[model samples]
Target: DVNFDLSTATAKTYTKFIEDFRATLPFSHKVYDIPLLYSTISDSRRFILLNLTSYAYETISVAIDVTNVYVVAYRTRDVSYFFKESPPEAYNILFKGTRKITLPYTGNYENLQTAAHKIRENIDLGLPALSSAITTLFYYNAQSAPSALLVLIQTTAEAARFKYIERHVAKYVATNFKPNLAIISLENQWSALSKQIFLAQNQGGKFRNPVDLIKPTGERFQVTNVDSDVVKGNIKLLLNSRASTADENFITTMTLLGESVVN
Candidate 1:
């Protein structure tokens, strides 16, 4: 199994590997006619397909395009072993880069797909051969920001569960960070749409319960409220936590999004 318990010296290497994996696995399907390509490949087994490339450009530049790609790593343990020790959360990292384009966001979903595809290609090729030139401006700033943790509390029907969870989160932060607690809401329109699309496209019209957070870092963890039968819950809020921790950095830069908005 791939190990996550890492030392400080190996953090950069670990980050690089994760970034590479995120960039390379999206365009492997051979027959699908979709714009974004999604697949998983490994040493023992390999599967991939190449879907149609993105088609969005004012001048129709074939040199630039976006594609969606994903790679998932699974660790299997026996039921008895699982009871003996709980496994860590699964990890997923996504990387996208554009050359000479000040803003990666444009008006076209096809272009977005193209950018996504390039990101997958970079990952497949082991994050290209760039030296230490990649700037840490985005990553470092994210690390320095305050942090908070949100957990959805499941409660009895008599209780308005999300409100309770929100209150609890506020109280926890109040005690821990005192006056510095950051107010954040986990709800977003895209997140909701994402769930709908995921279920309709992947799960064959059946909603999957308890979709856990992907690529969890040690310091912070997250989950979504997608249970259909129960009332949708509230999101957790956190304030100033150190960015030095891998988990903190992961949550800051990767989880909290809107990177492509308003560009």
Candidate 2:
């Protein structure tokens, strides 16, 4: 029999157990320490939250106990309404586990990693499968209500591979999710701008001829001459400013300038 004694385990012991489990995982993960005051008031139990984002994002909350480890997987929908007065309902066993697991005499990193891997895979498979139904439900709730969609992809990749994958995914999402609406990838826009700026700087800041600044929708603006020095100076000032709203002001100025030029 496992001779685990959770009742007498110190906070450090619980922390080390979580850290050991996290280190064994293959993908990136995050661990957060729960506040002692909250833990003490809530059943005098020590708690910790772990987040894993390999295939799908998942948050697990664990309650340390002398005999059993209570685990709960937090749902994303409920988390979206976290700041509201009437938050969405959380799942205990229906969505994720609420039951306790028998503690082992010693920490088993391999076992923990295997269990976590299965949980993440299940969540990944389940979320996308339910997306259409969820969207239908949202439509029923209110057809005119504002909604946002997000797609997560790996950021570290070769430039060619990144563009290829982004285009493929964007095409798939636009076709299947909302055929009527346009899909805009902001990262692609920033990337194009970065490349154009690099080329401009490399060519001694001289525009031999008028160049077109093309929009994502294929609209083009004829730029007769670009004062790269002035642009650089404004960017420098934006970065060096100490005011809290400096970034917002810079973005506003850029937006206004774009509108003025376009009109």
Candidate 3:
């Protein structure tokens, strides 16, 4: 049989860990409440809320089962007495020893899968490393910013190992994906453009000439002499409102531009 109450022990340990961690920080920190009961978990477990500033508080929760422990830290704006009063923002971090690990956004399944495999490999090497097998869990929103990484370290040493692996994973991602920043930014620009086109298509009257629209590379194109039919067809193609027609040059250009925007 298990010697300790896993839920209570983990929650209590987290409370002390966060408190001590806060005291070492330079920012103003206050413990508004300690070990507050959270309905989301069993009656045995509770959560802690720490005030990091006048406007924001960090709510930390812990959960544990037979072999795994999960920790979540969320930023909230409300100061309600109950843990469930305020909705938490998307950004958060988990700390192990002196290192601060930013949790990956919950929706990033590819990264989550890679992290999970790494954690399992560490666990397979030794049962003592069970504490750090943090796996990706459900996130609040698909469209929201990256959600916090779910950490699953069972003990202090496991936490250290988890951090070490996480550091390498982060480093690898950074090195390889540095070039993706420009592409991602360009995709966002085209998304905004699509919204604008949608709005213009629905509103009354002749739509303003979008010829002066800027590309991601800071270049602009002018379509002064195009006919109304061609302009309307281009808008349709950009928004994917209709099927492609036999206009070879127009279809090719739109197809290439669309692929660039998405890929």
* Candidate of highest lDDT: 3
Residue 212 of model 2, lDDT score:
45
Runs of candidate 2 with Cα error greater than 4 angstroms are 1-147, 150-190, 207-211, 214-219, 228-263
TM per candidate comes to 0.18, 0.19, 0.19
Ranking by lDDT: 3, 2, 1
> For model 1, how does the per-residue alpha-carbon lDDT over 105-160 read when each residue is reduced to its tens digit?
33332343454443211221111111000111112122211010000001000011
- lDDT of all predictions: 0.22, 0.26, 0.27
lDDT of 1: 0.22
1-263 per-residue lDDT for model 3 (tens digits): 01222122343443344335322222211111111111132212222322221111222233221111223333322211111112122122222222222344232334544544433222221111111121111222322212213322223212222222222222331122111222223333433443344444454423354433333243444332223222332221122222234246456346555666757
User: Pairs clashing in candidate 3?
Assistant: 103-149, 105-146, 105-147, 106-147, 131-152, 131-153, 131-154, 132-153, 134-152
Number of the candidate with higher TM-score, 2 or 3 = 2
Model 1, runs deviating above 4 Å: 1-11, 28-263
The superposed Cα distance between candidate 1 and the true structure at residue 166, in angstroms, equals 25
**Candidate 1 residue-wise lDDT at 77:** 16
Q: What is the C-alpha RMSD of each candidate to the true structure, in Å?
A: 23.0, 22.7, 23.5
The lDDT of model 3 is: 0.27
